[PDB]
């Protein structure tokens, strides 16, 4: 895509800011900042670009139907790409910490950050730290004098802070909570009591709903100075649902999709998590699929996996989901026409985000 | 302490308000607010609070000679309260993600915060990830309406990406520049050539007197609105040399200071780093104690490590601190004559941070 080929344009440009600014005022030496240059292409390319284009398309529509002179038009959707590109950044801080903890083995058809050889799980911490301090180098750098600064930062503030205390939720998921105590080893549930759909969409809120979808269209909306002509509470309601079905399909994809097309490896299974798919299959399994579940779910057992994908196979799940993006489909569908009311562009923006998160098969 | 008693009764109204946010705005569990409490106290308590009582005492010396209303008096006091534990819980992010990089054992009298059973190095990546957020939330909320927040906000960041930085300059010194590749497993150093002076200040600069010294003094400055009464060209230099030393003294102490008194086990020999005594050592050393150096350093064998020590007391490295110490004494000491040019109650209170810092035994 030519929108996209323009979006990566202003990466290299961002990364050329970034390296050269390592140089002139951090001594680095060329060998480290050639480390840093692989370790920014690893960890923020390679992917669909959602996020980042999300932000351009939320400005390209506004644009549209606003009046600029054809520089202040060339500043918006340099503005937009900017924004775009620390969502993108702040995702690969979360992908690299997220990676280590839930053991994972490729992202985006490439090993994980920290499996690579020479990075290792020591480097791979502090690399994630350094993509976020990425973000806000550039908010500052980029954004110095633009009136929508102090909102830019202050909302990247609560989302990051969401998206922590999300993986917080999402880490410690397959274990009881009136057993947590960080004096004694934590031992995985054996009820599966907090398996259930409302625990689920605690999680997924926080960890993938706040950074997915809330930051990138609110972003857009920052840039193009628009954010008076939404009702903000839409704005919420659509990001954290379209985010729950994205999440959803994550956990599905986990499970049923091929690695080579998926570019990751599951470990839900292996690593007991709360999934969509657990939650969905002990809110419709029978006594005794139940305990065939809890004698095989959490363990690295290529068989003990095998029986627990071999449950979800027979108790119809696919049913289940279709069920589930029906219902997804008639709110989304709603609140698409509650946006119209005020913003009809800013609507068909949501529109358009919708069908590629409704029709992605990676 | 009664002043670091009255700092602390801050960090429990800082500790309130966040964990009642937790669970007013973040749907959080009273099981999950309990571990991040515990989580709040191991990692930010414990500790000198030297970083904290800095911001403190900064803004006690130019209130002592400013007019102020007594409720002024009482913003700017709950102000360097509050801008002193955003460093101390910055310092907490640091400290947790470092002892997993230097695979520490116990962080002051306690095991590290990831070696805690019911923890474990998954929980505490994220954990410090909150840590660094909580500083965010903290500024937002106390510093507002503040004319200094803005500032306060883009140095806290600089700050953060030096240390970030600087830690990653930390965990890859001992291994040779030209031979980092991400692809290709790190082998440690052979003729430890990048083992110099030059080098060493390079990565102790960006690693610690940032956020250790530059940070504290400029908060107290911004609390106190004062950042124009001093030249900042002698503030960085100050910060910059105090800094220098105050990891100087850790280095050494890593080595020949008792675990019981100190409150860590030292792993600096075992890990191969880059310390001032390793450096030292190799500006001093003769032909043959140079070999036995190489030959022992880098390895987790008590008896290598031995050999290293017995190495470092035979040198008589104590005659080479001592040297160093009168060397930073002197120039500390022009510093702060320099300071009292423009402003010579911030002048007192560096004499006071020097003095502190050069009579500390842990
Ligand atoms: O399933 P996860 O939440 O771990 C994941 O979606 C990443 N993530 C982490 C937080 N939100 C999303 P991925 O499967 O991509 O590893
Ligand atoms: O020696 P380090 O740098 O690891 C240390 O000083 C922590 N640190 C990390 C960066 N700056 C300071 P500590 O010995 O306290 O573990
Ligand atoms: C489910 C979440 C939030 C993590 C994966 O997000 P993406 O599917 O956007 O990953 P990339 O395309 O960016 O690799
Ligand atoms: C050398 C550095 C910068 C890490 C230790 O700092 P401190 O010696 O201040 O640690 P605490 O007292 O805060 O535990
Ligand atoms: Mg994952
Ligand atoms: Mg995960
Ligand atoms: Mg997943
Ligand atoms: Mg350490
Ligand atoms: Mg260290
Ligand atoms: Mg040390």
Redesign the interface.
């Known amino acids: 895509m030519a929108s996209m080929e323009r979006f990566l344009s202003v990466y290299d440009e961002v990364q050329a800011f970034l390296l050269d600014q ?1 140089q002139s005022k ?4 060329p ?2 900042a ?3 240059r ?2 920014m292409d ?1 960890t923020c390319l390679g992917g669909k670009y959602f996020r980042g284009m999300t932000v351009v398309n939320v400005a390209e529509g506004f644009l549209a139907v606003t009046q600029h002179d054809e520089a202040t038009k060339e500043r918006i959707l340099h503005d937009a790409c900017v924004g775009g590109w620390m969502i993108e950044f702040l995702q690969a801080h979360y992908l690299v ?1 997220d990676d ?2 839930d053991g994972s083995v490729m992202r985006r058809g490439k090993p994980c950050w920290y499996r ?8 791979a ?3 994630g ?2 993509l976020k ?2 973000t ?2 550039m908010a ?1 750098h980029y954004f110095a004098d633009r009136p929508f600064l ?1 909102d830019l ?2 909302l990247f ?1 609560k989302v ?3 998206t ?2 999300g ?3 999402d ?2 998921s397959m274990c009881d ?2 057993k ?7 031992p995985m549930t054996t009820d599966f009591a907090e398996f259930t759909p409302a625990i689920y969409k ?1 999680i997924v ?2 960890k993938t709903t706040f950074y997915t979808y809330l930051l990138p269209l609110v972003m857009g909306l920052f840039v193009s100075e628009a954010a008076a002509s939404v009702e903000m509470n839409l704005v919420e309601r659509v990001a954290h649902l379209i985010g729950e079905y994205f999440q959803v399909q994550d956990d599905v994809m986990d499970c049923f999709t091929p690695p080579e097309q998926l570019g990751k490896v599951g470990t839900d299974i292996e690593d007991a998590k709360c999934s969509w798919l657990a939650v969905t299959f002990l809110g419709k399994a029978n006594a005794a699929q139940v305990a065939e579940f809890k004698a095989n779910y959490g363990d690295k057992d290529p068989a003990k996996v095998a029986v627990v994908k071999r449950l979800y196979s027979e108790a119809n799940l696919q049913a289940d989901f279709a069920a589930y993006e029906a219902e997804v489909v008639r709110e989304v569908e709603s609140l698409i026409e509650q946006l119209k009311v005020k913003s009809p562009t800013f609507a068909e923006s949501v529109a358009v985000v919708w069908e590629k998160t409704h029709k992605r098969k990676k």
Chains 1, 2 share one sequence.
């Open positions: 390592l951090y001594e680095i030496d060998n480290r050639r480390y840093l692989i370790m690893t910490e280590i903890m690579f050889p020479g990075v290792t799980t020591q480097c911490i502090n690399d730290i350094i301090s990425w806000q180098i500052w102090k930062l202050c503030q990051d802070y969401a922590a205390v993986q917080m939720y880490v410690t909570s009136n947590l105590d960080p004096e004694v080893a934590q605690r809120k926080y």
